[PDB]
């Protein structure tokens, strides 16, 4: 279809060509055979973690310390363990619970925070983006091209060979977007919108979830103890506010895109008459 058609170059050993998200290009000339050049695909290689959010916490290890009035600030001992989230509170007190003076007693409730599902955010750049470039002769074979090592010489045997310098510009603003992964569906979040979500988040290979309260409800106090729960899945209310992003497939540690194109110098010189 989009199979363009060019001609070597005015008595020269080169050609300057360009490809789209799909287009291929035939290059003809007197002496040398014709060479169908296609840009098969482009993928992101080995994406690194930048920040994964939680969307289904597990709350365990409850434990609420207390104190009447005139007994100061109740302090939960677990308040010394990072895994625990603690919210000092206040509750009615009186004779009915071992206090000689009706009034607001201190209270400190602690609970461990654990994550059950992470929305892992990843990043890419020049040092990892591949570019499939099939080459035919009229017998063929494909290969990949990076902004790091753009050129590539393909041995064609009895046909000859071809250098193929390149300039792998794309469409996406690299270092401006991220690869979000909610459940199985993968998406393309916009820079800030990502690190602007109100949810518990690990960092770079970190084991430290921050902004945790977001997912657990500290329920109505109760002289004795205080019930604490974790909120249901966010997957739902995360898909809902995330459909405008670009739906993609994170098939096997790689990413298929579309917004790409190459300007390549085809050194047909090495090609056999």
């Amino acid at each position, epitope marked *: 279809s989009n199979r363009d058609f060019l001609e070597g170059v005015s008595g020269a050993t080169w050609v300057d060509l360009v490809l789209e998200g799909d287009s291929c290009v035939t290059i003809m000339s007197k002496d040398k055979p014709t060479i169908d050049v296609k840009m098969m695909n482009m993928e992101a290689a080995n994406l690194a973690e930048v920040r994964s959010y939680c969307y289904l916490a597990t709350v365990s290890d409850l434990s609420t310390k207390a104190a009447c*009035p*005139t007994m100061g600030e109740a302090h939960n001992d677990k308040r010394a363990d990072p895994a625990f989230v603690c919210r000092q509170g206040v509750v009615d007190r009186g004779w009915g619970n071992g206090c*000689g003076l009706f009034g607001k007693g201190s209270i400190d409730t602690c609970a461990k925070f654990a994550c059950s599902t992470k929305a892992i955010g990843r990043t890419i750049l020049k040092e990892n983006i591949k570019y499939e470039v099939a080459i035919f002769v009229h017998q063929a074979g494909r290969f990949s091209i990076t902004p790091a090592a753009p050129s590539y010489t393909l041995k064609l045997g009895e046909y000859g060979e071809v250098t193929v310098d390149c300039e792998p510009r794309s469409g996406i603003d690299t270092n401006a977007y991220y690869v979000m992964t909610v459940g199985t569906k993968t998406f393309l979040v916009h820079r800030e919108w990502f690190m602007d979500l109100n949810l518990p988040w690990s960092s770079a290979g970190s084991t430290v979830w921050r902004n945790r309260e977001t997912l657990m409800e500290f329920e109505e106090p109760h002289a004795t103890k205080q019930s604490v729960i974790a909120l249901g899945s966010q997957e739902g209310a995360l898909h809902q506010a995330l459909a405008g992003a670009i739906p993609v497939e994170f098939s096997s540690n790689t990413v298929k895109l579309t917004s790409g194109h190459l300007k390549c110098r085809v050194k047909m010189e090495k090609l056999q008459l």
Partner: antibody
Amino acid sequence: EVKLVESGGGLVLPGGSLRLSCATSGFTFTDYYMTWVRQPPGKALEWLGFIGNKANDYTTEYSASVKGRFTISRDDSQSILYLQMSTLRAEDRATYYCATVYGNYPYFDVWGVGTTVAVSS
Amino acid sequence: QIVLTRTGGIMSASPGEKVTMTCSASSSVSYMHWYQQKSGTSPKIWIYESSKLASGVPVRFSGSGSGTSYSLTISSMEAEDVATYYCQQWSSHPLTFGAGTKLELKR
């Protein structure tokens, strides 16, 4: 440890006023209730009033002997206690103590030096 | 108001000797506290909720009491026990102290 140092004691005429201070340290002032107790030159020991903490709306309670005459205030920002005093007379002559309150069933644990209040012309 | 009339206004005790002061109350009561004041010093909490000994307090001291009758007892009198001892009531308002029991070492 704890520090309860009274201040603002002197001689005053039968009817005058005075504001007693209890500068504290070595603990979280706001957290605890607080009380004033006076000891007359006669050993007897009179509770005057206490004042709750922030979370208890600074609830206060006074003894029959101090209705109107005095009122207690808390400078939670600097761990300071005050006992504003007005229209003193013969009976108010004493040594005024400033103690914290504590325990499930309240008791005055850490008292202070005390401060001397004389009423005469 | 509930008045705490103390039994044993003043008393002497020979070292090693067991001592007992009484706190009589003009009305029922829940708990009773005891304070120790040594000449010059400001009071100190000593017995709280009838029988729980304050901290630092020697295990020699002890308190019993229920309703309107309460007492503290030194197991074996000793010089450092020389002081005045006051009882405080809590069950009612206002808060009340007793007159105090002066304790002297009979040396």
